[PDB]
Scaffold this active site. Structure first.
Site, PDB file in Angstrom:
ATOM      1  N   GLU A  85     104.151  17.776 115.256  1.00  0.00           N
ATOM      2  CA  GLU A  85     105.247  17.227 116.016  1.00  0.00           C
ATOM      3  C   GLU A  85     105.227  15.708 115.872  1.00  0.00           C
ATOM      4  O   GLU A  85     104.168  15.051 115.906  1.00  0.00           O
ATOM      5  CB  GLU A  85     105.216  17.532 117.533  1.00  0.00           C
ATOM      6  CG  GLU A  85     105.279  18.946 118.078  1.00  0.00           C
ATOM      7  CD  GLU A  85     105.323  18.915 119.617  1.00  0.00           C
ATOM      8  OE1 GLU A  85     105.680  17.876 120.273  1.00  0.00           O
ATOM      9  OE2 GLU A  85     105.007  19.988 120.201  1.00  0.00           O
ATOM     10  N   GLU A 126     100.000  21.925 122.860  1.00  0.00           N
ATOM     11  CA  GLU A 126      99.322  20.708 123.309  1.00  0.00           C
ATOM     12  C   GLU A 126      98.361  20.944 124.449  1.00  0.00           C
ATOM     13  O   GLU A 126      98.326  20.208 125.455  1.00  0.00           O
ATOM     14  CB  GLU A 126     100.367  19.666 123.738  1.00  0.00           C
ATOM     15  CG  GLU A 126     101.461  19.483 122.689  1.00  0.00           C
ATOM     16  CD  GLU A 126     102.402  18.334 122.914  1.00  0.00           C
ATOM     17  OE1 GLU A 126     102.871  18.084 124.047  1.00  0.00           O
ATOM     18  OE2 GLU A 126     102.746  17.636 121.896  1.00  0.00           O
TER      19      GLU A 126
END
Ligand SMILES: *[C@@H]1O[C@H](CO)[C@@H](O)[C@H](O)[C@H]1NC(C)=O
Ligand SMILES: *[C@@H]1O[C@H](CO)[C@@H](O)[C@H](O)[C@H]1NC(C)=O
Ligand SMILES: *[C@@H]1O[C@H](CO)[C@@H](O)[C@H](O)[C@H]1NC(C)=O
Ligand SMILES: *[C@@H]1O[C@H](CO)[C@@H](O)[C@H](O)[C@H]1NC(C)=O
Length: 344
Positions: free
Chosen positions: A276, A169
């Site tokens: 995710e 991320e």
């Protein structure tokens, strides 16, 4: 069959089979010191019908830990060290070994955006600047690329690697979106210069996409532009994550988040991986529809829930959080076995 993971049309080709895949995230798998715990966890994932597992490729520290504690890299201004010892990348070597044995493929990110297991913060502590100058901090990038090389060179010819992932991320809060574009372009080219067998991906959450409804995740406040990033030549597929609970949106808004990202991917000619996702309240009810949306949307090549939970031969349980789906639980039935059955 075995062989390298590739892209065939807009789908993934895993061991010679072209088609949608389900997987899971198991960050903590990389840090298991008992081999038997990796094997039991991987036996469960494989018996559940999941094909891909996402595991941390990093464990960054500024100070050497207590003897016996795992660490992959120690970041220092006076000379960094990459740990290839028993308490080091040898634990990741077994994870790769076990994946090969269990017929699983791995997604492996090289650094964390977040400070968990060091992350960009650990580089900042060693090399100065801050979380957003990190991307263009010469000493930090030099050590990051040396770590990339130390990981990549270990598994470049292994068929167990699904993809290399630039980071977990990555964000550049308030930055021009070009900072990540240029950094990702350069790093992905470097990864490809080390390994021409494997796919490479960014590992971003998908933030910044103008086809949505204007909620914050669709805006450009975190330095990423999804459509720009996914058109980078040296990135083979897009990634996007989803957490309505942390983002201020409701759960059903997740369906449009998948659809818009899938379209962006397909517009770039590549598959998307819904990499995710989690819901803290009622995960069975709120996440099942996301699974169905991803499975039924053109441009989606697979989905990986956030996160596997399991327990070991000595009675210890794995690391966990409010999103954990425990193996063999009710939510495992709802979000794993029933999803896998639907893919068939
Ligand atoms: C990070 O450093 C850059 C360059 O000094 C600066 O422009 C930016 O304001 C800093 N970020 C924060 C959050 O202080
Ligand atoms: C390993 O993979 C590289 C491509 O990344 C290839 O050039 C090399 O021949 C392979 N090594 C062996 C021993 O086959
Ligand atoms: C959730 O959000 C969307 C707007 O993004 C709205 O149209 C819908 O009614 C809401 N659904 C629930 C269940 O709150
Ligand atoms: C999982 O569930 C089955 C019952 O469906 C049982 O046979 C097996 O022992 C269980 N595995 C674990 C790890 O508990």
């Amino acid at each position: 069959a075995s062989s390298f993971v590739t892209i065939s049309g807009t789908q993934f080709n895993i061991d010679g089979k072209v088609g949608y895949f389900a997987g899971t995230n198991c960050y903590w798998c990389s840090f298991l010191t008992n081999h038997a715990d990796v094997d039991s966890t991987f036996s469960h994932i494989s018996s559940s019908g999941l094909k891909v597992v996402r595991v941390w490729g990093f464990n960054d520290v500024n100070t050497q830990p207590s003897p016996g504690q795992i660490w992959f890299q120690k970041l220092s201004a006076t000379g960094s060290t990459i740990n290839t010892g028993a308490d080091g990348l040898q634990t990741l070597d077994y994870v790769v070994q076990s994946a090969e044995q269990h017929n699983l493929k791995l997604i492996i990110p090289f650094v964390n955006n977040w400070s968990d297991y060091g992350g960009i913060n650990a580089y900042v502590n060693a090399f100065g600047g801050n979380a957003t100058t990190w991307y263009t901090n010469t000493a930090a990038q030099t050590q990051y690329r040396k770590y990339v090389q130390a990981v990549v060179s270990r598994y470049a010819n292994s068929t167990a690697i699904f993809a290399w992932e630039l980071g977990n991320e990555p964000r550049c809060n308030g930055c021009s979106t070009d900072v990540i574009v240029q950094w990702a372009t350069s790093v992905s080219q470097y990864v490809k210069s080390l390994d021409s067998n494997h796919l490479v991906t960014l590992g971003d959450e998908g933030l910044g996409l103008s086809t949505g409804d204007g909620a914050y995740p669709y805006t450009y406040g975190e330095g990423t532009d999804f459509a720009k990033n996914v058109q980078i030549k040296s990135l083979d597929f897009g990634t996007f994550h989803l957490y309505p609970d942390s983002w201020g949106t409701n759960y059903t808004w997740g369906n449009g988040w998948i659809q818009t990202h899938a379209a962006a991917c397909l517009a770039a000619g590549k598959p998307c991986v819904f990499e995710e996702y989690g819901a803290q309240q009622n995960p069975c009810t709120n996440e099942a529809p996301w699974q169905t949306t991803s499975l039924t949307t053109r441009g989606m090549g697979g989905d990986m829930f956030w996160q596997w939970g399991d327990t070991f031969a000595n009675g210890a349980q794995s690391n966990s959080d409010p999103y954990t789906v425990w193996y063999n639980s009710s939510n495992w039935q709802c979000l794993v076995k029933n999803h896998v059955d639907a893919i068939n």
